[PDB]
């Protein structure tokens, strides 16, 4: 029968052997790198599995990310590589694994969690719901070329510039109160900057990173504070583009390029969705940034069989960009939500769509205006996939 387990650096082959049944083998190249990058998860309590008898039959790992929510950085458990063997169909193997993944994360002090679901039913059942997007837009390289900004000094960047990149990014997001985006460890970011096939460029108030990994020029991140720098960095890109007509870029759907280029992005675009769950509701609220003008005094009834600790009646108290979540004895027409409703609300989804989706019931409409302006802001997005 079924046993939760900590994957050893040994049994990585077993994990790959399971994974293969659903995805086929890796190239011997991509395989050597998969294994090299797994060891860190293994020796930091961040690679879990399910064993049946003496046989690894399921596995999942946990990134220790941080994530911007309203301009603050909240520790989050990014779940990836969930695999279950096909001959263990419908024996609730995935649920045991995921129940272990969840408490491992709660134990390590991650008040929230996120993933890209391969299917949605299994994750909705454990209390996840959609929280944001990843957008990919396509541009014409010639357009990026004629943006100008030739006076701006742009140089090539390497791993010695990681401190500088974090600084620029953390300044930008804190200003705009961004939500959804990943914070990568300064360590992990230097590696990215050392990658022979990663091209990174630094101006005084911005940077750009792009790659050629698929026959196509792709921009992974652009950050720029002034118009000048923005035009220089995009022109550096359009200039690296050789003769290719088009260039892809991961960016917010509010990004200033759209306001700068002469041809609109191509109508064909990529829209992905990622999911969110709260693991420690008070803590998540504590770390969150709230819209600076927000007053809100609201009670809410929480039903979370999966994390009973945060189940019950609570009062939300927010003002001055900060929030607190505390138990409550009150007795009124309160708001009722489950883990999904609770995660979706944290993610700034409008209460109208949540009532229509049945993810929340009850309470007065006065409260709906409040939480909409409190949890409101720019729509959550990220640039990464995992």
Applying the rule CB under 5 A, the residues between 49 and 88 that interact with Cl ion are 81
Residue with the two structure tokens 């019950």? 312
Q: Are strands 296-303 and 335-338 parallel, antiparallel or unpaired?
A: parallel
36 annotated as ligand-binding: no
Spatial separation of the C-alpha atoms in residues 314 and 290, rounded to whole Å: 18
x-or-dash string of contact with a second copy, 230-269, rule CB under 8 A: x----xxxxxxxxx---------xxxx-xxxxxxxx-xxx
Q: Tell me: is residue 242 an annotated ligand-binding position.
A: yes
Backbone φ/ψ region at 362: left (φ over 0), alpha (ψ -120 to 50), beta: left
Cβ distance 316 to 323 under 8 Å? yes
Q: Identify whether the C-beta of residue 383 lies closer than 8 Å to the C-beta of residue 361.
A: no
Residue 94 marked in a binding site: yes
Please report how close the Cβ of residue 199 comes to Cl ion at its closest, in angstroms.
Answer: 17
**CA–CA dist 253, 149 (Å, integer):** 23
Supply the minimum distance, in Å, between the C-beta of residue 43 and a second copy.
Answer: 27
Question: Does residue number 159 form part of the binding site for a second copy (CB under 8 A)?
Answer: no
53 lies in the binding site for a second copy (CB under 8 A)? no
Q: How far is the CB of 262 from a second copy (least distance, A)?
A: 5
Site residues for a second copy, 262-281, by CB under 8 A, read 262-265, 267-273
Residue number, nearest CB to Cl ion: 81
Residue found by looking up tokens 């809100």 in the block: 296
Q: Which is nearer to Cl ion, 81 or 362 (CB)?
A: 81
The CA distances from residue 78 to 28, 53, 67, 104, 275, in Å, are 26, 28, 10, 12, 10
Tokens of residue 96, six digits: 């045991």
Give, as ranges, the residues between 302 and 361 that touch a second copy (CB under 8 A). 340, 344, 349-350, 352-359
Q: Is 91 annotated as a binding residue?
A: yes
Interface of this chain with a second copy, residues 77 to 106, rule: CB under 8 A: 84-87, 89-91
Selected from 3, 8, 9, 20, the binder of a second copy by CB under 8 A is: 20
**Helix, strand, or coil (residue 8):** coil
CB of 206 to Cl ion, least distance (A): 30
Q: How far apart are CA 283 and CA 110, in angstroms?
A: 9
- Binding site per annotation, positions: 82, 84, 89-92, 94-95, 118, 123, 125, 145, 242, 262
Q: Which residues lie near Cl ion (CB under 5 A)?
A: 81
């Amino acid at each position: 029968d079924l046993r939760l387990v900590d994957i050893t650096e040994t049994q990585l082959d077993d994990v790959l052997r399971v994974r293969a049944r659903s995805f086929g083998l890796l190239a011997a190249g991509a395989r050597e790198d998969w294994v090299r990058d797994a060891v860190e998860f293994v020796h930091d309590g961040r690679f879990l599995g399910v064993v049946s008898g003496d046989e690894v039959v399921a596995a999942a790992r946990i990134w220790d990310f941080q994530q911007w929510w309203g301009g603050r950085r909240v520790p989050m458990a990014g779940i990836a590589g969930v695999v279950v063997a096909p001959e263990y169909r419908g024996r609730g193997v995935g649920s045991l694994l995921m129940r272990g993944v969840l408490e491992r994360s709660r134990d390590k002090g991650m008040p929230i969690s996120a993933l890209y679901p391969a299917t949605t039913v299994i994750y909705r059942h454990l209390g996840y719901e959609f929280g944001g997007h990843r957008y990919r837009f396509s541009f014409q390289a010639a357009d990026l070329r004629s943006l100008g900004g030739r006076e701006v000094a742009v140089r090539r960047a390497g791993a010695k510039d990681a401190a500088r990149f974090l600084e620029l990014v953390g300044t930008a997001h804190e200003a705009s109160r961004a939500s959804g985006l990943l914070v990568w460890p300064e360590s992990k970011i230097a590696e990215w900057l050392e990658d022979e096939e990663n091209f990174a460029y630094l101006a005084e108030d911005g940077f750009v990173v792009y790659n050629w990994s698929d026959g196509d020029l792709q921009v992974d991140e652009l950050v720029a504070h002034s118009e000048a720098t923005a035009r220089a960095l995009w022109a550096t890109v359009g200039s690296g583009a050789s003769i290719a007509r088009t260039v892809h870029a991961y960016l917010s759907p509010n990004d200033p390029v759209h306001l700068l280029v002469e041809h609109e992005a191509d109508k064909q675009a990529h829209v992905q969705r990622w999911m969110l769950r709260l693991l420690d509701a008070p803590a998540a609220i504590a770390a969150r940034g709230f819209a600076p003008g927000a007053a809100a005094e609201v009670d809410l009834l929480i039903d979370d069989p999966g994390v009973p600790a945060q189940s019950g009646r609570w009062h939300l108290s927010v003002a001055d960009g900060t929030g607190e979540l505390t138990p409550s004895d009150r007795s009124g027409d309160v708001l009722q939500l489950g883990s999904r409703g609770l995660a979706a609300l944290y993610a700034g989804t409008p209460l109208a769509a949540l009532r229509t989706a049945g993810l929340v019931t009850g309470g007065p409409v006065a409260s709906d205006r409040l939480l909409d302006t409190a949890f409101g802001g720019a729509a959550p997005y990220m640039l990464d996939y995992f």
